[PDB]
Amino acid sequence: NSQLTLRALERGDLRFIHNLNNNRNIMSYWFEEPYESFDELEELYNKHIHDNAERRFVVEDAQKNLIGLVELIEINYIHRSAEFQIIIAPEHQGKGFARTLINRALDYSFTILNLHKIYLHVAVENPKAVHLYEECGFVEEGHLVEEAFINGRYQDVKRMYILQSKYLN
Amino acid sequence: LTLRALERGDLRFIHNLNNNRNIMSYWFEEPYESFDELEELYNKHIHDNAERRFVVEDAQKNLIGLVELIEINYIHRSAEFQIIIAPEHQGKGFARTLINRALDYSFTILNLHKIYLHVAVENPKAVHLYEECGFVEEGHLVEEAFINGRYQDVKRMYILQSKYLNRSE
Amino acid sequence: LTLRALERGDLRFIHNLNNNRNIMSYWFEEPYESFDELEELYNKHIHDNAERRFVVEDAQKNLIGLVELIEINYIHRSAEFQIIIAPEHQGKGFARTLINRALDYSFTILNLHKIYLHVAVENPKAVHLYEECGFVEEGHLVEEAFINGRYQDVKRMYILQSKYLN
Amino acid sequence: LTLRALERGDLRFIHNLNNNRNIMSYWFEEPYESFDELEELYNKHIHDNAERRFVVEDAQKNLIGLVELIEINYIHRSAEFQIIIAPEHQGKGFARTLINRALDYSFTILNLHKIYLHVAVENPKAVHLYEECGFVEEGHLVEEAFINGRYQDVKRMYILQSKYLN
Amino acid sequence: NSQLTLRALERGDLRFIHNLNNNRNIMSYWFEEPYESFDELEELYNKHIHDNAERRFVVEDAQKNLIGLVELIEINYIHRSAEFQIIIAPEHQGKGFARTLINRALDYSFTILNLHKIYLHVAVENPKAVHLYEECGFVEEGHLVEEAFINGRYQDVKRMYILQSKYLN
Amino acid sequence: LTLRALERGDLRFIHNLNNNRNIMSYWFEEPYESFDELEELYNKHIHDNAERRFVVEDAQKNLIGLVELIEINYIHRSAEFQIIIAPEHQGKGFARTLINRALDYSFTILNLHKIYLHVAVENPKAVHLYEECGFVEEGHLVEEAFINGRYQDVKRMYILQSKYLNRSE
Amino acid sequence: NSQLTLRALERGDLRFIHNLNNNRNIMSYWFEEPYESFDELEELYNKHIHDNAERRFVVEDAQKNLIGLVELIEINYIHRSAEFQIIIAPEHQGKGFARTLINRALDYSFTILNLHKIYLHVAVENPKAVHLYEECGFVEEGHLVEEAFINGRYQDVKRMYILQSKYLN
Amino acid sequence: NSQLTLRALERGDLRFIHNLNNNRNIMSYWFEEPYESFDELEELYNKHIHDNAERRFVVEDAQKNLIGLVELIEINYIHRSAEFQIIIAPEHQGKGFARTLINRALDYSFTILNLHKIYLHVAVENPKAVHLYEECGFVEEGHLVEEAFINGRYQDVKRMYILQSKYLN
Amino acid sequence: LTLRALERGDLRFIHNLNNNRNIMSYWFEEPYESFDELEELYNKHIHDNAERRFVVEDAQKNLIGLVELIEINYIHRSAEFQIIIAPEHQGKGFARTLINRALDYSFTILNLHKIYLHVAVENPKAVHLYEECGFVEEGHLVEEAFINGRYQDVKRMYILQSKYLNRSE
Amino acid sequence: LTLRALERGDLRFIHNLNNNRNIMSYWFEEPYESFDELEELYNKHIHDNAERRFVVEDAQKNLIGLVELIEINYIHRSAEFQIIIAPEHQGKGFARTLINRALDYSFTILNLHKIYLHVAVENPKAVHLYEECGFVEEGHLVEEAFINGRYQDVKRMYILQSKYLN
Amino acid sequence: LTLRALERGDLRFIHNLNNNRNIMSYWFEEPYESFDELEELYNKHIHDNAERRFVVEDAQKNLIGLVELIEINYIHRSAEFQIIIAPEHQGKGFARTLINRALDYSFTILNLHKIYLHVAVENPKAVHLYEECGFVEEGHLVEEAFINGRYQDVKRMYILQSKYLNRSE
Amino acid sequence: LTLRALERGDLRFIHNLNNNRNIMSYWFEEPYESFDELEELYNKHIHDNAERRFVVEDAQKNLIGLVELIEINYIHRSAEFQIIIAPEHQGKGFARTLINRALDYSFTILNLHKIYLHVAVENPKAVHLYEECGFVEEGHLVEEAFINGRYQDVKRMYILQSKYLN
């Protein structure tokens, strides 16, 4: 876990992004723009190469095996907020990397960019994921009713947050 | 009461409404403060369908207020609702009528499934007004906004298409 | 009654016709609501030949209604027809004379083979008028349009160049 | 069989599928014939969401066919469906499993209400297969398509999100 | 007739072009581009302001009454050819202006631009117009079968020509 | 025999065909003489539907000739036909087969009503070849082209959709 | 003083900006771009209409007499900093407006944009201006040696600051 | 001589153009644009790829040895004129190719493009070149005094011409 | 008499001058016939220094004529001269004065070495007028222009800088 | 007398000053003659800092003359100076007060080290005035300018920031 | 030791240097984190002279570090200095040599008058290093930067052109 | 020795000549330092005729030096001259033969009247060589160049087309 490294996303890593969106049954977005094919993603990356609303970091190990991804979106510098998301490759989902990657993301958000609040969304029907984030410091602030259409049915999603104060202290 | 799509001529009425608010005003997720800044971003997003705004005026062309629909996603069929009545006609009882006619357009024309909005916790008069129109609280965002030199909480209330169109049946 | 090619000055009348229809208005398969959005869309598609619109006006030049041809396909030689008469002169019985001249332009100048249209099921009076003008049903599209918070069926009627020109 | 988002490298397979169809091919309602014209049209509409195409391939990744969604309207939540299987694997009975997955993507992710398609009248075998997949006729378009020097009728069949998702 | 004058077509004259195409029941073209409304014509004129494939001259009298129009299209300088057309306002069609305007057009084509051949097209069912051109020097060179779709039916058109040699001698 | 839409790679084969002609070659009514001039105008009119060209090749990719459809008007439903067989396979009897397959595409796919072509009067072998395929003379254009230092006449022959599809019925 | 109002800068106010830069003997900048004439300023305003690095507010009284100007430049949202400047018309310089305009600017910076630190620069040879700012809450943090070339000689400038904490408490 | 062939100028031939302008001590032009380096020529060729005012043909033999160049400039299709020029490589200047290349150029000008007059310019101090052209059919029409600045001194140049009539008869 | 650089407002006066000529008028080697065609090409070549034109007017703003310098080459230091006096003031004896003042600008400001012009052989009055001003015939171009349906000859006369500035010394 | 930054409205006065000079006028090292050519060149170089021009006007705002700085180099900190007074107020002795204020702007705000200028040899009165203002000759350029059909010599005079600011 | 202007090929070496810093890196006042983001902003500001950077390498092309000059104002003749030596050659004593050669370029080539820099107060080793090279403290910016989750102070040191070039005289 | 028009491939040699000069290098009056900045500036001014540069190379094609003409004015017919020889072949005495051919191109093809140049005062050996080639001083520019932290004087020498062509 300590060997894991985070690196700024490069064009070469777009293939890894495409592979991770396979068999997830949810439309993928790139700066709030839908995409499906590798070519559509590559164009959207070239377009938003300069945008500051989102940042992404690839997660690798010592031997540079692509572990997962860390995304920050809806980044606002006036209110100092950002939506956090994390995607771990299926082959590494059950190895406990998630917790460390969550602290790595909070570290980058609250120590460098100096953001005030980090919020995230979790499906209500994955309580193990909710409890994980709670053990990491997050806490619920909303229960969005029928917010996401997942697998052919509207579903609720928990919005949980954590402030810069608690993480730094 | 009559609702009309916003024309470029009504932009000044929007700027005037933003004078008393004392909050950072946005136009398609882009900050603005001068009337000229607004007019240019209006010419830029005249075709963008991510947001739609309607100005309401009396029978004889007395502009009363404004209703806005932002963060419009036609895949999730959602949108954020907001309304601002001029201080002149603020307490004449026009609010609820504009709200219902806004939700009517969202649920009968655009065929949207969910409509949410945000209100500061320090103004319970608005919280009860929307709750009287069918909105229900789905979140209590902690320290979401920075108002007058302090971080404050925000209530997120919602209303669904099914309820608005089938409740009296 | 006289039909005239749609000009930029008539876009105001278009915006008024869409004032009380309770359905999203399109311009070359692109939505719009405000007069400014329409004016820009017109200047964008001013040369696109996939759609053609004529304004019908009285002898005094008082605008009466509108006739539109959309989805114009010159390979299969077909196009969709739509007609909107102002509420002021809706029941003056002018509708038929407008439908005929429209079909005349379609089958005499543009040289199109088929002309279809869509009419709501819950408005049988329009179905009869169209039928009496020469149209015949060819489809009962199920839940094709979302009107007033509920999907509704729509009848698709057609008319060939042969029946109008013998 | 596995469906994959259409890439630029697959445009060659598209041009081969259109090789022996005897009808003009379109890309976002724009005609084309050569592989160069198609490649430019794709780069032009690479971000347009009005159409979506998936390539179906074997376990060995041998391309088998194509499934397309066109006329995608997110307001009325509808789209037209089309499927083309290569002649090599036309009669292997895979057609049904392709139609279902397509409807699955339409009604599970994009959240569309209706899906319609058009099939020639003189090919009843396709009408039966579509019917057995869940489709039901809603229109008999008269002389809607010009095939082999003669206008021919076309049946329009539909299927709602309700029947597929209960 | 001798008082008639020909002038290069200006933007202001586009209204006269539009008025002449009323009740002619044939699609109007501007540099092989279809148009119907005044605005569509004005745009096409601005576009082809510089093109050399076609020239047009307005026909006026002493008191500047708009008499008609003289068009040269499909102008090719390698083969030295051009298709001639003439449109006279309905109020002046039966006053004998046509003959002089035909000589004026031939004069400009064979004396200035120095073209070799001028051809034109006439409906087979207007023999009075054919005989007119023959009396002016033209002669048939083709009987195009079902070349034009006029008033709801394909119709034949006579193609008649005349060379620079005969006009100059 | 197999007809294929012309790709950019076949442009050299077109230039080679224009070597023996000794006539000004055009591309969408634009003159060209160098292979590079052709390639640039090809990139310019790749989307223009006013003309369509097909290259025919043997069973094992031996490019034989070319068939062209120019002046395509989808309102009048007309088009000018032309065919050029390489000097290698010139007298192998492939012409009539390419002609019929060209008219078949024009009358069954594009749904055109009339197809005309042009041939020099000084090559009666071509005049009889087309006449054997259904074409009929509709015009004898006098001094229409300038060939080898002299003005020559040109025959315009035509064939209709009705005849091509209904004659053997 | 209490009647003074601050308004977002509009294009019409550019004339007031030009008048204030008269007889100040220092090159004027607009988003770090030099200018002298009214036309050069107007162009630079149109260019940076959308930039977020600087904001400016016109200062008016009850009767809308142009009092002065309030400028925020070098605005950085990551470090939350901004350089403050104030220009009062010569006819209003000795009426005590400065103090209130300083609090108005700090109010907008620390209560809306939520910035952490506001710094400014003062000529060392204007101690009355330095003492003013100190009485307003500022304090020196640097004595830049020969930083500005004023009136034909390099001169030192005091850099004084104040944090959001003290102003809000 | 009979084996010589003329080919339309291609981009690959621009190196031959550059080599021929070596040690000629006169500024080279490309569509009335000066150039010296290979890169400047290549850009000007890409620019005027489509211009019709000039045409150029490379002269090769049976074994494709680059013999010379044939240039037509100032081509006007209204007056039907063109300035002719010919450049033979130094290794082939004294082999009698000039005469045949002159007839080849006249053949292309008077038989294909159908031009009326071909004029050329010759230095007065090269009478052998003047007599050559006279033997080819040209004749003097002007003695331009101090028209060209050659090798550090203004010099006269003979303008000689020939019409399409004499060449064709 | 006073010469003034041509402004856009004088373009109509140029078009009027081209009415009586009955010859193809050009603007930077580009044909034009309508006033709008002229105005657009004027906006296109406002910066082109290949040609320069001056309008002359009386003491009280009575526009008399025009003098033009075209084909200006600053390497060879040459230019073609032409002058057109309105038919109103045609025979008032102003020509020679405008000519000398044109050559004065060419030889004293632009520092040109040679000035040539062209005149039809069928107007000896102009030939003698220029010859009286210092011009000398250097060429008799045979069938250079096509005037009123016939090819005619043109005289090219010239005058040198040395003569114009040193002859009376 | 008051100097003001050159505006677009003053371009007319510029064109009048060049009316009777008998020499080609330049704008940012680009020739021009007509007011339209100048107006476009100004809009092109409105942000170029290589040149700066001030209009001097009376108390009544009657334009008197012009002062220009060209070839402005901020690395070597130098610039060429030129002054043109209208013929109406040429001999009113205002020239000196204009030269000084110009040098003041060059050496007090822009922080330039050297300022040079060029004056014809055949006009010694201007050479004296410049000399009396602080300038000193540094070059006798031989046949550098072509004036009235003959190359003429030009004197280049200079002045440093040190002599003006002690 | 040899200093060289930075080429596009050296951009990767810059990104590597920014890995160990753990601070937001900028390029012409624009944030970046990915190598591709850097490369695009490099192509954008290749002409911008507001900043200049030099890469230093050993005698045999061993890239050691980088020296940067930003906020270059040629009117005030100032600039901010910064240097980053790779961790490999960090403590080899190369720093002072690169500093002096940077100030030499700033004071002898660009002819700048003042050079300032910034250093964190929590690294006195750098403060003394610059002080040993001639830099003197002119400011102690309080809570200027946000480093590792806390606001920290920054020292601004400066050195003048006169001192660097005249002190040993 | 042979002079050749400067190509894009020679820009590398240009960047090497500027490697050890200790002064800012310009390209069409625009500063640059890196090879990438120079390559873009060349493509920008590849057609500008205000400057012309020739590369001089040996018989073996080993690059020896460079000759440049800048500030080319075709109205007054003048231009500034500069020559740079690589340190490898600086003292081989080739300098004179290069200066002559340059002046030959200026006065034989471009038809220019005057050619001036600038040489530092503290390098009298170059002043003598230029003088022996035909140049004559016409100006002693005072503190015109900032070299090695100190303003230095520069001599401006000239040569007319008449003296070179009699």
Numbering used by the authors:
A (entry chain A), E (entry chain A), G (entry chain A), H (entry chain A): 2 to 170
B (entry chain B), F (entry chain B), I (entry chain B), K (entry chain B): 5 to 173
C (entry chain C), D (entry chain C), J (entry chain C), L (entry chain C): 5 to 170
Question: How did the manuscript describe this experimental structure?
Answer:
Spermidine/spermine N-acetyltransferases (SSATs) are catabolic enzymes that acetylate polyamines and are critical for maintaining intracellular polyamine homeostasis. SpeG is an SSAT protein found in a variety of bacteria, including the human pathogen Vibrio cholerae. This protein adopts a dodecameric structure and contains an allosteric site, making it unique compared to other SSATs. The allosteric site is located between monomers that form the hexamers of the dodecamer, and some evidence has been provided that shows when polyamine binds to these sites, the dodecamer tightens.
